[PDB]
Symmetry: C6
Subunit: 219 residues, 6 copies
């Protein structure tokens, strides 16, 4: 990554073995659960395109997801090339060549060029752009790899309400690739067992989740 | 987080993998026991709203508690917007979603936190998060304090352990402790009542040994 | 904690996750064995009252011991307030206010104030004072939670002398006897409670035998 | 490795035990799967030829692959010597002798000479050149140790399409030591080797479908 | 410990949790095998008497050995007081052992010009006591190490020099070579005597391969 | 070890617990396999004689090998004293850290020009470890024969692993090793290898015998 030292310099630093092993183990253990996407975004803090490619390429399995991710990266790179055409001619002294789509993705750019863009005045954050594309692709992968539909989450006859809500919002987070309505509240209240459904319907509209789980604690 | 370097400057630093793994494992292993809230407050030392959202979002399970936490954060953000509705260099004040890192960038968060005077959006957001976590800890407590009664052959030390564990869970005030003397078995209750008021817990546990 | 940087300044540093995990695991694994108190004193090196409260509050179990520790801390704070009365007289124009009992315990003081007292010239080491109180309370807890009395430590018929002396001095360390009481109780109880073989051998060594000679003769 | 410190100096640093153990365990657990090569490239960040030789020599097994790697390194060194004949003359003042093939491989060069080449202005990245050669040899080893041909990857009757594509691009990555492998023949072989149901759906999607659309259309079949 | 930072200054540093855990686990796993003494000497690099007392006091078991070590430290302190009955004050025996000296005084002696290494002296005493403990905790006598009928010579020499290192509290003579050749099984004994006197261990183990 | 700080100075640094534990675990797990010697050379990077003695003395087992190593170190020190008759000049035992202090070792290693007592001692230690590795080698290269159904890759693995063990080195390939390699292969792979002809690289040999 590119981090700031003690002398106030933006310098390049080798990616640590702890970060590599952490990302590899996160992918091995959690597959493409939603919480993988924050973790990735946290483990690639200040990363260069080379570091991002390193994190993605060290994954051994999930090659379908990785190939999808390459297709998404190519789409976003083509859009970047359409919106930011690199002008021909020679580069002025003291200036950097403008990055193509593959330059942001670390395919046709060197590490020295990536450091140059990221530490230039004004900076071109190629690492953050590439990370944005990668996070788009990973959102697609998370939505695709979601196992269960939200319509199939129904509270058991003797299942506690807390576990039912856990499965509900876990499934919803998996299918939306996001933790961010009225249809969700109605689907939530509708799929409860008769007791909790009667209590929740008795609570009236406009109720919060804390009140809902408090009213069904032990029912 | 935003930390002070060995040269005296307040700079931004990437959140360490050990802190992330430590928080994730704390949530996975301890669920929402009370001691999770201090640990969190220690692992988010000097954290920005982005770092707080990172710590909360890396949690895989307990999505009911996390959604409750989002509701609490939205409530506190709406309250902030209600309590905080032109100079040349008048810096913009943070909205509710700006403190929560929803509508603010890392550059803006560092801007508020390092301004003169500073607006510690990280500490405010951490205050809201700790409120929500207090609610979650209070709800996830298994037993009520009124249901903590000393067994016929239960040692007094274990009974006090369960008593103050449950009490700590439900109080995420001082008159509740009176229940400790009331819910003891007849022997220990008679001895403790004989000790009178002003008796410390050490004397109580010694008298019932 | 408060540590020294490169330019010789005493600055505040966030408590590391390794120290937190080390303290939590020490409490979980060793309960309130005596060696926990030195370990604590080592893990809280240079700690502020906030850091000490963090270390105490991260303990999940032993809430009876933690409440006892809170009572002891309140006692020592009240004694501090008794020994340092707030004087009603002429204060110097640059006279900094002295910390109260609750200020040293981190209850009514902020982190900036704690750093202020600890880094002042001359310093008021509120962290070391609070750590002294906490170590007093932990001493009480260790003394109370000691399972066996020293009078009940008797060498087994086939128990090796090394294991018997190990249990003897472990129990003695747990009960915390003064050097005179530990020397008398050690001289009479140690030799007296040995099995007939080791007792005969030890008696054959003559008076004034050191523990090394006693354990060598019974090997 | 040669890294930059807090004061912006390029200094030599002893290779860390964590990097050594990480590389050794990666070789022990993953053998010569493709993902080993990126990992290597990450663990040898800023490495000198001496550090590269250290990482390669700490490998205990796979001595056939290691000896092959020595042959590849010697070939690339001979090619370097063919492309850069050092002039039989005296070294200019304030300069360094140009590195031969064995100098880049750390065989006939000292650590101080490697630091000299790597920290000179302009630098001669002997570590990056040697790493390029090593990555060539490791690419050969990965392609050779690939167990299955891409032609033998056929979707099972009840195998999910996601697992079939996983095995497909995993095998293809192993056989090419690369992930930029998706062309026309791979897309047609991919659609062709699917089970009748998924093959009918994929052909019904039409030409030019993305992999996301292909796996979405065959989800739950 | 007192270590040198990146700016060439000798400063005091808090003992790291990794060193504490390393020492505690070394004592728990290896007990008082000889190799514990070098490890200790490595983990107490640059340590003050306070740090040494910290390392010794964190040991939970082996309280007999710890009391022995305390007695040995008191003996060496009494000997130091016997040898030492703008002039800086000299440290007494209890000052070197960290009993009657503060951390400020220890740093004062250790960082003076010329330095008075109270930490290295205390470490010398502690290593003496630990040598005593290692010699006592040795399980087997060297005279009882005899090569088995089908035991390889390499394993026999391993046990031989492990036991010898345990009873010497050091691995650094001729009676050991004669006892070694004497304690071999008949085959290896005939081969070793056929090698002749003055044979090195490499030749002895090579001849029995 | 002696490492470089921010002011460009060579200063002494306490040996880390992770390096000690790494070396101890390497000895416990790998015994005296050849790859231990590079690992050692990497874990003692910039080490002082005191640090080298620390790494060697923390080994709990293999006391026969450690005593052999002590004998080799004493031989190399006596030879150093014979070749260099007498800051004070270092003796053989001074380089081995026996009769020298840490301050003296730092003095020699940080002098201009430096006297690398750590690198000399490390050379001696690596000599002794080479002896130990060659002795602890289990099998002779002449006993490595390809099984009837053993893949050629595994046979070459055992071949060059055994050869590396018997020479304490990887630079071992020559004409005798190539002819012994082709000779000890099973009839099928031997026929294919003979069909390749001379000058065939190991890559071509392993490709021709695949499957
Ligand atoms: O006190 P800590 O926060 O736990 O700092 C440690 C310490 O780093 P510094 O002393 O440089 O701050 C370790 O250094 P050692 O002395 O053990 O070598 C280092 O380990 P490395 O040697 O592997 O650099 C480790 O870093 P890592 O996280 O990469 O394990 C890092 O811990 P933090 O990174 O968590 O601060
Ligand atoms: O001495 P230990 O308490 O057993 O500490 C180890 C050690 O961690 P540290 O050296 O950072 O304290 C391992 O680190 P390695 O050098 O083996 O890498 C680490 O393993 P990881 O590398 O996987 O982090 C492991 O952690 P884990 O529990 O996740 O296996 C952790 O053990 P504890 O966590 O029990 O302290």
């Amino acid at each position: 990554p590119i981090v700031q030292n003690l002398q106030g310099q933006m310098v390049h630093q080798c990616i640590s073995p702890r970060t590599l092993n952490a990302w590899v183990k996160v992918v091995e253990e959690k597959a493409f659960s939603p919480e993988v996407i924050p973790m990735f975004s946290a483990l690639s803090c200040g990363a260069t395109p080379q570091d991002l490619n390193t994190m993605l390429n060290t994954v051994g399995g999930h090659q379908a997801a990785m190939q999808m991710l390459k297709e998404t990266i190519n789409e976003e790179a083509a859009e970047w090339d359409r919106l930011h055409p690199v002008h021909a001619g020679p580069i002025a002294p003291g200036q950097m060549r403008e990055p193509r789509g593959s330059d942001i993705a670390g395919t046709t750019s060197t590490l020295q060029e990536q450091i140059g863009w990221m530490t230039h005045n004004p900076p071109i954050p190629v690492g953050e752009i590439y990370k944005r594309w990668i996070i788009l692709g990973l959102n697609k992968i998370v939505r695709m790899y979601s196992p269960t539909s939200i319509l199939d989450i129904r509270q058991g006859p003797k299942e506690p309400f807390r576990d039912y809500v856990d499965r509900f919002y876990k499934t919803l987070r998996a299918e939306q690739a996001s933790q961010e309505n009225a249809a969700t509240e109605t689907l939530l209240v509708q799929n409860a067992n008769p007791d909790c459904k009667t209590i929740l319907k008795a609570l009236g509209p406009g109720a919060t989740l804390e009140e809902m789980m408090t009213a069904c604690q032990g029912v």
